[PDB]
Amino acid sequence: SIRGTSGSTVARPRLFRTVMTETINGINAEDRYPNSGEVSQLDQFFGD
Amino acid sequence: MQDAITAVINNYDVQGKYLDGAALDKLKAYFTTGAVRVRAAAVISSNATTIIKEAAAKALIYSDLTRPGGNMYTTRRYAACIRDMDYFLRYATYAMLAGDPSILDERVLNGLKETYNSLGVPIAATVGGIQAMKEVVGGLVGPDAAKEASIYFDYLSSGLS
Amino acid sequence: MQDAITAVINNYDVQGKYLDGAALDKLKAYFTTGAVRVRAAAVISSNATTIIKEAAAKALIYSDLTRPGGNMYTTRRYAACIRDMDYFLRYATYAMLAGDPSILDERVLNGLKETYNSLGVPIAATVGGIQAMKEVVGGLVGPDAAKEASIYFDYLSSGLS
Amino acid sequence: MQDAITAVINNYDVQGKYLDGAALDKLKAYFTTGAVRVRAAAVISSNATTIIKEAAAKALIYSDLTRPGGNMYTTRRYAACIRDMDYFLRYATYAMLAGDPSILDERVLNGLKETYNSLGVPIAATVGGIQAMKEVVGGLVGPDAAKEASIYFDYLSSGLS
Amino acid sequence: MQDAITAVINNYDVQGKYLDGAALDKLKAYFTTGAVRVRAAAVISSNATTIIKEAAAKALIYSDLTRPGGNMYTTRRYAACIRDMDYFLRYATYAMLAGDPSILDERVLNGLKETYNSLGVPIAATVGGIQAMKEVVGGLVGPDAAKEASIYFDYLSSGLS
Amino acid sequence: MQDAITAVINNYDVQGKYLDGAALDKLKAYFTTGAVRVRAAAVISSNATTIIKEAAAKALIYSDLTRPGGNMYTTRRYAACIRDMDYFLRYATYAMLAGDPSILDERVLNGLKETYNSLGVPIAATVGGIQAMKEVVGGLVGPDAAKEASIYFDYLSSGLS
Amino acid sequence: MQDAITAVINNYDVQGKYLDGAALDKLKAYFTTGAVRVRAAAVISSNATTIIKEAAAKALIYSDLTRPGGNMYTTRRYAACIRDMDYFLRYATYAMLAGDPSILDERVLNGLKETYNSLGVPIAATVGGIQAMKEVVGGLVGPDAAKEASIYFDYLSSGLS
Amino acid sequence: SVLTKAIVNADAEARYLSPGELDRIKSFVASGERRLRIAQTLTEARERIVKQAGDQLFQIRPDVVSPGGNAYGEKMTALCLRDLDYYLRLVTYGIVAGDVTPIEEIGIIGVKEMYNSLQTPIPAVAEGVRAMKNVATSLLSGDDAAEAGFYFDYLVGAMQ
Amino acid sequence: SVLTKAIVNADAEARYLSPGELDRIKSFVASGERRLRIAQTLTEARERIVKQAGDQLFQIRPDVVSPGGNAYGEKMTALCLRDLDYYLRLVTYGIVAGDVTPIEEIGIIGVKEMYNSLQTPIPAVAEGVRAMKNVATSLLSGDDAAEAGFYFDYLVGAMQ
Amino acid sequence: IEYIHRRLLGRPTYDRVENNRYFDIASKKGFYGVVDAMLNSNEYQEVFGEDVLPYERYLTPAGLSLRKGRFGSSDVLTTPGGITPRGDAARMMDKI
Amino acid sequence: PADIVRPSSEDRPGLTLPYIYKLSADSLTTFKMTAIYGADGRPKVNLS
Amino acid sequence: NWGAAYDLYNYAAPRRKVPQFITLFADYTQPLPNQHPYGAGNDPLEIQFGAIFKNSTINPAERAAPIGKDVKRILIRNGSPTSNERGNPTGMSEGA
Ligand SMILES: CCC1=C(C)/C(=C/C2=NC(=C\c3[nH]c(/C=C4\NC(=O)[C@H](C)[C@H]4CC)c(C)c3CCC(=O)O)/C(CCC(=O)O)=C2C)NC1=O
Ligand SMILES: CCC1=C(C)/C(=C/C2=NC(=C\c3[nH]c(/C=C4\NC(=O)[C@H](C)[C@H]4CC)c(C)c3CCC(=O)O)/C(CCC(=O)O)=C2C)NC1=O
Ligand SMILES: CCC1=C(C)/C(=C/C2=NC(=C\c3[nH]c(/C=C4\NC(=O)[C@H](C)[C@H]4CC)c(C)c3CCC(=O)O)/C(CCC(=O)O)=C2C)NC1=O
Numbered sequence A: 001s002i003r004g005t006s007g008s009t010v011a012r013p014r015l016f017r018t019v020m021t022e023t024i025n026g027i028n029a030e031d032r033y034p035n036s037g038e039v040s041q042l043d044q045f046f047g048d
Numbered sequence B, C, D, E, F, G: 001m002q003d004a005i006t007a008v009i010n011n012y013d014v015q016g017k018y019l020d021g022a023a024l025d026k027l028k029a030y031f032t033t034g035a036v037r038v039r040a041a042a043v044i045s046s047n048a049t050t051i052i053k054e055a056a057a058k059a060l061i062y063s064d065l066t067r068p069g070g071n072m073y074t075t076r077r078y079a080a081c082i083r084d085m086d087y088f089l090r091y092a093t094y095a096m097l098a099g100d101p102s103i104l105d106e107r108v109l110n111g112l113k114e115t116y117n118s119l120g121v122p123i124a125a126t127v128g129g130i131q132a133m134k135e136v137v138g139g140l141v142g143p144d145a146a147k148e149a150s151i152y153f154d155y156l157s158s159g160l161s
Numbered sequence H, I: 001s002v003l004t005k006a007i008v009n010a011d012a013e014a015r016y017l018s019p020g021e022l023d024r025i026k027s028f029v030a031s032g033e034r035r036l037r038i039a040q041t042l043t044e045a046r047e048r049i050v051k052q053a054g055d056q057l058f059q060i061r062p063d064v065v066s067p068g069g070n071a072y073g074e075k076m077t078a079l080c081l082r083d084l085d086y087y088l089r090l091v092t093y094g095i096v097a098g099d100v101t102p103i104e105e106i107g108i109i110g111v112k113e114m115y116n117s118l119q120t121p122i123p124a125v126a127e128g129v130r131a132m133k134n135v136a137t138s139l140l141s142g143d144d145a146a147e148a149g150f151y152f153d154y155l156v157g158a159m160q
Numbered sequence J: 001i002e003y004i005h006r007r008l009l010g011r012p013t014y015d016r017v018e019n020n021r022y023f024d025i026a027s028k029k030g031f032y033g034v035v036d037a038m039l040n041s042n043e044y045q046e047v048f049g050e051d052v053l054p055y056e057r058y059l060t061p062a063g064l065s066l067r068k069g070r071f072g073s074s075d076v077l078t079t080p081g082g083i084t085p086r087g088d089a090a091r092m093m094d095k096i
Numbered sequence K: 001p002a003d004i005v006r007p008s009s010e011d012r013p014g015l016t017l018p019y020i021y022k023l024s025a026d027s028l029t030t031f032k033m034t035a036i037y038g039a040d041g042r043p044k045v046n047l048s
Numbered sequence L: 001n002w003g004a005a006y007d008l009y010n011y012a013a014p015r016r017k018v019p020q021f022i023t024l025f026a027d028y029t030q031p032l033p034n035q036h037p038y039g040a041g042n043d044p045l046e047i048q049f050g051a052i053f054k055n056s057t058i059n060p061a062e063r064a065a066p067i068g069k070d071v072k073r074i075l076i077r078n079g080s081p082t083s084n085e086r087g088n089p090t091g092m093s094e095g096a
C-alpha cells in the first residue's frame, strides 16, 4: 500500500485575521505599496 | 475504482479470457453476501453522526488533543477533524458495499500520510479514531455484517501507519 | 519483508495497539491453514524442474519465441528465461508459505517491468509462462492448497501487466 | 525554438557581433537546401497516414505488443500509440524544415523517457516505430531529401534510448 | 505571514499563554516605533523609481553585466532585473512595516537561490544591487528610520548568499 | 565549496581582474569578524550534545513523533534523527566559520527535500528541530556571534521548506 | 561493440542463416580495404599529439574560450578539453579500423550531449574541434585512407549536434 | 458495472448512498445470477458462434474476402474471426456486470482510429456483430436472448 | 519470525524450501498455543510486572531517583517505567514470533546511540530489564518460564 | 557514497540496508571510514580476491539502455502462437 | 452556516470544508468587472 | 496530489519541464520503479569517467518513491545472464 508519493511541504495555515495581516495581505493582491489613504490606517492602529 | 465484480472482469480482460469456473465462483461469493452489505450501509448512514460522536468520545476528546497545544484545539480544527472522520466512515461504507478496498487507495490514502506529516496531524491518534468508529459500527450492524464492515476500517488504519 | 504473523504485529504497532480480538482472529485464520501450506511447498520444491518443463512446453517453446528473431532464441537466452521461471516459482512458494505477497514486491516486481522493456523481454509471453506454472502447480498440490498457491502466481502476473 | 538561421543569430547576439563571413557561409548552406526541404515536407504531410500504417505494419502490430498483456492492446492504447506516431512524424517534419533539432527537445523529448517508464510504454519498440517511419519516408522523398529527413528521426530515437 | 503584533500572539498561543508582562512589553516596543515606520514607507514608495535608478547606477550598469555575454544584456533581461529590484524594494518595505522578516522568506527567498542558479543569474551582483538600494534608502528616510529599514535589506542579501 | 575569501577571488578570476578596492573592502569585512567566528565554533563544538538534547526536548520528543506511527519511533529512527541533527549543527558551524553558505548547498541541501519525501521524513518537524538548535546556540555564543551563527541555521531551514 | 564482420554475423545469426553470397560480398568489401585501414591507424597514432595541437590551434585557442569566463579557461579545464580531444581521435581510429561506428555510440556518444549540457561544455565549439582534427588527419593519411577516416569524425560530430 | 456507474455518482456530491440508489443496487444483484448464467452459456458455444457468424458475414459481404478486401486470404480471415471472438468475450463481460463499462475501455474507445489505420471497413465489423447476435440468440431462452441482445446492439451502435 | 528468517534463505538461493526448513516450520507452529498462552499471562499482569520490576531496580540501584539522577522526579520516573513497559511488550512479541527480528528493529538497533544521547544510564537499564524476568517468571509454569526467560536474557544481552 | 561504491566494488548498491550501513559510518568516521568498508568487506574478498582488480559487474537498466538502445531495438517482439504475416511475401518471391 | 461543499465529477471526489475554517484565513481578493447593462449599446462598464 | 499541487502553485513552477501529474497518477497505480532507495537523482549517469548526477535546483525534476528497506533492486549483469548471483550464488567464479 502506497505506491507513490509526491512529497510533503511546510504548510503554514492561518489561525486568525489580526489587522496587520489583513491590510498587508490586501496590498499584495494588488501588488502595490500602501495607498496614500492606507498609510493613515496603520497609524491609528499603531496609535492606539 | 473497482469493485468485487470489475476486479474479476479486468483481471480476465488483460488475459483476454472469457469468464471461466474460477471467475464465476468468485462472483457468486460476492453476490451471495450482497443483501447484507446493503442493510449494513443503511445502518451506518442513518447513524453516521452518532458513530462519530461515540468514536470521538472514546478515542479523541477529554484530552490534551483538544487542549491548547493540541491539534484539535480551536473550533476550526475540531471541525476539520470530525469532518475527516465523516470521510473515513463514508468511504469505508463505499469500500464495504463494493467489496473492494481500491477506492480507499485512490480517493483517501494516496498522499495522506505525508499531508498529515506536513500539517502536523497526529497519525496514531487518527488511527484510534478509525478503530473506535469500527468498534461502534460492529455493534450497530450485527453478526451478519460485522466482519465485512470491519476490514475496510482496518484497511484505512494500516494505510496510515 | 512481512508474513501474516509479522504483518499483524507491524499493522498494530503503528497504532500502538495490543493485540486485540480482531488481531487474534486474523492470526488464527493463518495458523489454521499452516500445515497445508507446508505440504504444498514440499510438492512444488520437489517437482520444480518438471513444472517449469511442462509450463514452458504449454506456453513458450515450439514457437516464434524460440526461433531466430525471438527473445528466447540462443542457448544463452533460453537459459536466462527458464532461470527466471525458477525465480518466479520459488518466490511464489515463499509468498504462499508466508501468506503475504510483500516479498513478491520487494524482491521480484520492483523495477522488473522496465527492466524487461529495456532488454526487450516480452511481457505478455512471460505472464503466460507464469499462468502455465500455476495451472501445473494447482494439479500437483490438490484441493487443500490449490487456491492458496494460485493467488501468488496471479499476484506476480498482474504485477507485470 | 530555433532554426538554422536563428541558431546563428543568437550565437552571435550573445557576443554582440554583426554577422561575419563564417556566419554568412552557414546561412547560405541552409538557404541553398531550402527548396528541397519544402518539397519533402509536402510528400510527408500528404502521405502521413500511409507512412504510419506501413511503419506500424513492419515494426509494431502482428505481435505480442497488440495481444492481451501487450502495451498496444485495447483500441484505447492502439489509438494512443499511432497518435504518438503522428506526433513524431509531424515534428520531425518541422525539425527538418527548420534545419534544427531544438524543437524536438523542447516539445517532444523533454521528460518523455520517464513518462514512458511511468506508464510502462516500451521504449525499444517505440524506437523501431520511429526507424520504420524513417525507412518509409526515405523512399517517398527521394535522393534530394533522404539524408536530411532521416537525421531528425535518428535524433528522436537516440533521444529515447 | 506574520507581523510583530501577530507573532506575539501565535508564539504565545502554541504555549496556550495569556498575554503576560513580557508579551505586553514586546508589543509596546513595536507600537512605540510604528508612526516612524509609516513615514519611512511613504518616502520609499514615492521615491521607488529613483532608488532603483541610483542603485543600478552605482552597482549594476556601466559594466560587463550590461554588455554582450552579461546577464542583464538585452532589453528583455535588463527589464527583468529592474523588475526584480522593484520586488525587493517593495517587499522590504512590507517587512519593515510589519516589523517581521517572515514575509521575505515566504514570498521572496523560498527557492530563489536555486532559481537564480538555474537561469544563471549572478547572485553576488544581485546582493550589491540590494545593498545599494539600502544605501539610498537610508539617506532618504533619515535618522528616525534608517536602522529599521536597513535590516530587511540585510535580511534579503544574506538570504541569497 | 567556497568561503568569504574564495567567493571574491572566483568572482574576480572569471573577469580576470586583480583585486580592486571594492574587493579588498569585502575581504576586510570578513577578516575583521574572524576571531569571533572561531570562539563561537569552540562553544558550539564543545556543547554539541547538549544543544541537540535541548533542541529535541523543545521541538521533537514528548509527542506523537516519538510514539508508534511517528517517524522517530523505534530506537533505529530516533538515532537516525539525532544523527541528522548533529550533521546540521556541525555543517552550520562550518558555514559560519567560512562566512559562506555554499557548503550547506553542496553537501547538505542537494536532493535532501526529495530524500525526505521518499522516506516520509516530516519536513516541518525537522525545520523546528533546526530553529530550536539555533535558539540554544544564540544563547551560548553571546552578543558577539549570535546573528552570524543564526543565519546559517535559517539558511538550512528555508532550504527544506 | 561490433565491427564490419561481426555486424554481418549477428545480422544472419538472428535469422539463423549460414552466410550466403550477399554476406560474403560484404565481408570481401571489408577485407579488401583492410591493409589501408592499418597504415592509416599507424599514422594517426604516431601523430596523435600534433593533430590535437594543430586542431586546437585552428579551432579552439586564441579565443574567448581560453579567456576568463570561457570553458577552457584554467589549466584544469584546458587539460580536460585536450584530454577529451585525445579520446575522440583514439576512438575514431578504433571505429575506422573496425569499419563500424557502433563503438562510437556505446563508449563515447551515450549520454555525452547531456553531460556537456550539465557541465556547460560548449557543444558547437567541440564539434569544430572534431572537424579540425579530421582536416589534419585527412592530410596525414593520404588518398588511400582519407574518406574512410573522415566518416567516423563526421559520425562523432553529428552525434553531438 | 451498475455499481461503478453508481457509488461514484454519490460521491461526486459527498453523500451516502441514497435509499433509492441502493435499489438499482438491488435489481442488478438478482439479475446478476441470471446474467452470470447467460455469460456462461455464451462462453460454452463460443467456437460455434464465431464460425457461424463468420459464414453469415462473408455471404452478406463477400467483398471483404476479395482481391482488394481487408480480410482477403486465409490469415487475413483468421485474424478477422479472432476479432469476432474478442467482441463476443467483451459481450459476456458486459452482460455479467450489468453495465457495459469495461467493454467500452477495452474495445470501442479508440476503435475507429485502430481500424482506420489498418484500413478495416468498420461497418462490416458491425455486420459481423449482428451475425453473432443471430447465432448466440438462437441458444438462449426468449427472455435471456433479449437481455443478451441489448449488449450486441450496443457494440453495433458504438461502431458508428 | 522463523518464517521470515528461513524463507529469506530460500529466495536468496532461488529455491523452494528444504525438507529441513519445512520440518522446523511444522515443529515451530506446533509450539503456537503454548507461546500464545505465555504472552497472554504476561500481557495480563503487565502493570504488576513493571511496578515490581521498578521497585526491585531502585533498591539494587537508587541514585537514579536522586538529585543528580537521570530518573529524578515524578515525570522523570514516569518515563523510566514506561521504557520498562515498552521492553516487556517487545518481549511478548518475540515469544510469539520465536525469534528477535521484531524485538531488534524496534528496540535494540540504535539503542546505544539513543540512550547515550539521553545520558540515561544504560547499564542500570539492563538490571532493570533483568528484574522483569524475575517477576514475570514467577507467574509462569517451569517450562513456560524458561521459554520466556530466553527472550528476557536476549534483551539483557543486546543492551550490552 | 553511491558513486564510490561503483568504483570500488563494481556494482551499484542493492538496498537501503547497505546504503545505510555506510551512511551511518561516514558520519562517525568520514571519508576514510567509508572507504575502508567498501575495501574490507567480505564481498570484496570473495569477488576480487587479492589479485584481481575490480571490474564492473552490474549495470542498472537505465544505464544499459543508454549504451545500447540508441536506434531502438531492431527486432520485433515475437510471441509464441501469434498469427503473423511477416516473411511470407518474401518466401513467395523466392518460390516464384 | 453550512459547510462549503466543492462538487466533483465521476473521477474525483466531492469534498467539503468547515465554514468556520475558511473564515479564519485571509479572505480572498477578487476582481470583477460589471455586467454591462442595456440602455443603448455596450456596458459602459460603470466602473471607476 | 497534495505535494505536487503545492509545487505547481509556486512561482517557480515553470522552471520544471518534466510533467508531474501525469507521471504521478501513473505511479500510484504501478509497482515501484527502479531507482535508488532515496531519490531518482541519487544515481549517477553511467559513462566512463564522470560522476554526473542531476541537480535539484538546476532544472528541477524530483521523483521519489516510497521504497521500503527490504526492497532489493534489480540489476542487470554486465556479462552473461546466468551468472547473476541472485539466482546463482557463485557466478562470479565461473569463467569470464
Ligand atoms: C475560544 C473559543 C473556543 C471555545 C469556547 C471552545 C470550546 C470547546 N468546549 C468543549 C467542550 C465542553 N464545554 C463544556 C461547557 C461549557 N462551555 C462553555 O462555554 C460554558 C461556560 C460551559 C457550559 C455552561 C462541556 C460540558 C464540554 C464537554 C463536551 C461534552 O458535552 O461532552 C470542546 C471539546 C473538547 C473539550 O472537552 O474541551 C471545545 C473544543 N473552543 C474554542 O475554540
Ligand atoms: C476525500 C478524502 C480526503 C481526506 C481524508 C482529507 C483530509 C485532510 N485533512 C486536512 C486537515 C486536518 N485534519 C485534521 C484531523 C485531525 N486532527 C486531529 O487532531 C485528529 C488526530 C484528526 C481527526 C481525527 C486537522 C485538525 C486538520 C487541520 C490542519 C490545519 O490546521 O491546517 C486537510 C487540509 C485541507 C483542510 O484543512 O481541509 C485535508 C485535505 N482531504 C480529503 O480530500
Ligand atoms: C543455435 C543455438 C540453439 C540450439 C542448439 C537450440 C536447441 C534446441 N533443441 C531443442 C530440442 C531437441 N534437441 C534434441 C537433440 C538431440 N537429441 C539427442 O538425443 C541428441 C543428443 C541430440 C541431437 C544430436 C531433441 C531430441 C529435442 C527434442 C526434446 C524435446 O522436445 O523434449 C529445442 C526445443 C525445441 C524448439 O523449440 O526448437 C531447442 C531450442 N536452440 C538454440 O537456440
Ligand SMILES: CCC1=C(C)/C(=C/C2=NC(=C\c3[nH]c(/C=C4\NC(=O)[C@H](C)[C@H]4CC)c(C)c3CCC(=O)O)/C(CCC(=O)O)=C2C)NC1=O
Binding pocket: D061, D062, D063, D066, D067, D072, D073, D074, D075, D078, H064, H069, H070, H071, H072, H076, H077, H079, H080, H081, H083, H084, H086, H087, H106, H107, H118, H120, H121, H122, H124, H125, H128
Ligand atoms: C479487444 C479489443 C481489440 C480488438 C477488436 C483488436 C483488433 C485488431 N485487429 C487487427 C487486425 C485485423 N482485423 C481484421 C478484421 C476484419 N477484416 C475485415 O475485413 C472485417 C471487417 C473484420 C472481421 C470482422 C483483419 C482483416 C486484420 C488484418 C489487417 C492487417 O494485417 O493489415 C489487429 C492487428 C493484428 C494484431 O497485432 O493483433 C488488432 C490489434 N485489438 C484489440 O485490442
Ligand SMILES: CCC1=C(C)/C(=C/C2=NC(=C\c3[nH]c(/C=C4\NC(=O)[C@H](C)[C@H]4CC)c(C)c3CCC(=O)O)/C(CCC(=O)O)=C2C)NC1=O
Binding pocket: E061, E062, E063, E066, E067, E072, E073, E074, E075, E078
Ligand atoms: C541591444 C539592446 C540594448 C540596448 C539598446 C541597450 C542600451 C543601453 N543604453 C545605456 C545608456 C545610455 N544610452 C544613451 C542613449 C541616448 N541618449 C540620448 O539622449 C539619445 C536619445 C540616445 C542616443 C540615440 C545615453 C545618453 C546613456 C547614458 C545614460 C546614463 O548613464 O545615465 C545603457 C546603460 C549603460 C551600459 O551599462 O551599457 C544600456 C544597457 N542595452 C541593450 O542591451
Ligand SMILES: CCC1=C(C)/C(=C/C2=NC(=C\c3[nH]c(/C=C4\NC(=O)[C@H](C)[C@H]4CC)c(C)c3CCC(=O)O)/C(CCC(=O)O)=C2C)NC1=O
Binding pocket: E060, E065, E070, E071, E072, E077, E078, E080, E081, E082, E084, E085, E087, E088, E107, E108, E115, E119, E121, E122, E123, E125, E126, E129, L011
Ligand atoms: C515576487 C517575488 C519574486 C522574485 C524576486 C522573482 C524573481 C525572478 N527573476 C527571474 C529572472 C531574471 N532575473 C534577472 C535578474 C538580474 N539580472 C542580473 O544580471 C542582475 C544580477 C539581476 C537584477 C539585479 C534576470 C536577468 C532574469 C531573466 C533570466 C532569463 O533570461 O530567463 C524569474 C524567472 C521568470 C521571469 O523571467 O520572470 C523569476 C521568477 N520572481 C518572483 O515571483
Ligand SMILES: CCC1=C(C)/C(=C/C2=NC(=C\c3[nH]c(/C=C4\NC(=O)[C@H](C)[C@H]4CC)c(C)c3CCC(=O)O)/C(CCC(=O)O)=C2C)NC1=O
Binding pocket: F060, F065, F070, F071, F072, F077, F078, F080, F081, F082, F084, F085, F087, F088, F107, F108, F115, F119, F121, F122, F123, F125, F126, F129, J019, J020, J023, J024, L069
Ligand atoms: C552529510 C549530510 C547528510 C544528511 C543531512 C543526511 C540525511 C539522511 N537522513 C536519512 C534518514 C532519516 N532521517 C530521519 C530524520 C528525522 N526523523 C524525524 O522524525 C525528524 C523529523 C527527523 C530528525 C529531526 C529519520 C527518522 C530517518 C530514517 C528513515 C528510515 O527509517 O528509513 C537518510 C537515509 C539513509 C540513512 O538512513 O542514514 C539520509 C541520507 N544524509 C547525509 O549524507
Ligand SMILES: CCC1=C(C)/C(=C/C2=NC(=C\c3[nH]c(/C=C4\NC(=O)[C@H](C)[C@H]4CC)c(C)c3CCC(=O)O)/C(CCC(=O)O)=C2C)NC1=O
Binding pocket: G061, G062, G063, G066, G072, G073, G074, G075, G078
Ligand atoms: C591562468 C592560467 C593560464 C595560463 C598560464 C595560460 C597560458 C596560455 N599560454 C598560451 C600561449 C603561449 N604562451 C607562451 C609563453 C612562453 N613562451 C616561452 O618560450 C616562454 C617559456 C613563455 C613566456 C614566459 C607562448 C610563446 C605562447 C604562444 C604559443 C603558440 O601560439 O603556439 C595559450 C594559448 C593562447 C591563448 O589562447 O591564450 C594559453 C591558454 N592559460 C591559462 O588559462
Ligand SMILES: CCC1=C(C)/C(=C/C2=NC(=C\c3[nH]c(/C=C4\NC(=O)[C@H](C)[C@H]4CC)c(C)c3CCC(=O)O)/C(CCC(=O)O)=C2C)NC1=O
Binding pocket: F061, F062, F063, F066, F072, F073, F074, F075, F078, I064, I070, I071, I072, I076, I077, I079, I080, I081, I083, I084, I086, I087, I106, I107, I118, I120, I121, I122, I123, I124, I125, I128
Ligand atoms: C520501544 C523502543 C523505544 C524505547 C525503549 C524508547 C525510550 C525513550 N526513553 C526516553 C527517556 C528516558 N528514559 C529513561 C529511562 C531510565 N532512566 C534510568 O536511569 C534507567 C536506567 C532507565 C529506566 C529503567 C529516563 C530517566 C528518561 C528521561 C531522560 C530525559 O528526559 O533526559 C525517551 C525520550 C522521551 C520521549 O520522548 O519519549 C525515549 C524515546 N523509545 C523507543 O522508541
Ligand SMILES: CCC1=C(C)/C(=C/C2=NC(=C\c3[nH]c(/C=C4\NC(=O)[C@H](C)[C@H]4CC)c(C)c3CCC(=O)O)/C(CCC(=O)O)=C2C)NC1=O
Binding pocket: G060, G065, G070, G071, G072, G077, G078, G080, G081, G082, G084, G085, G087, G088, G107, G108, G115, G119, G121, G122, G123, G125, G126, G129, L047, L048, L049, L050, L051
Ligand atoms: C571515454 C569517453 C569519454 C568522454 C569523451 C568523456 C568526456 C567528459 N568531459 C568531461 C568534462 C569537460 N570536458 C571539457 C571539454 C571542453 N571544453 C571546452 O571548452 C571545449 C569546447 C571542450 C574540448 C574541445 C571541459 C572543459 C570539462 C570540464 C568541466 C568541469 O570543469 O567540470 C567529463 C566530466 C568528468 C571529468 O571532468 O573528467 C567527462 C566524463 N568522458 C568519457 O568517459
Ligand SMILES: CCC1=C(C)/C(=C/C2=NC(=C\c3[nH]c(/C=C4\NC(=O)[C@H](C)[C@H]4CC)c(C)c3CCC(=O)O)/C(CCC(=O)O)=C2C)NC1=O
Binding pocket: C060, C065, C070, C071, C072, C077, C078, C080, C081, C082, C084, C085, C087, C088, C107, C108, C115, C119, C121, C122, C123, C125, C126, C129, L074, L075, L076, L077, L080, L081, L082, L083, L084, L086, L087
Ligand atoms: C531475484 C529476482 C530477479 C528476476 C526475476 C530477474 C530477471 C532478469 N531477467 C533478465 C534477462 C532476461 N530475461 C529473459 C526472460 C525471458 N525471455 C523470454 O523470451 C521469455 C518471455 C522470458 C522467460 C519466460 C531473457 C531472454 C533475458 C536475457 C536478455 C538479454 O539477452 O540481455 C535480467 C538481466 C540480467 C541477466 O541477464 O541475468 C534480470 C535481472 N533478476 C532478478 O534478480
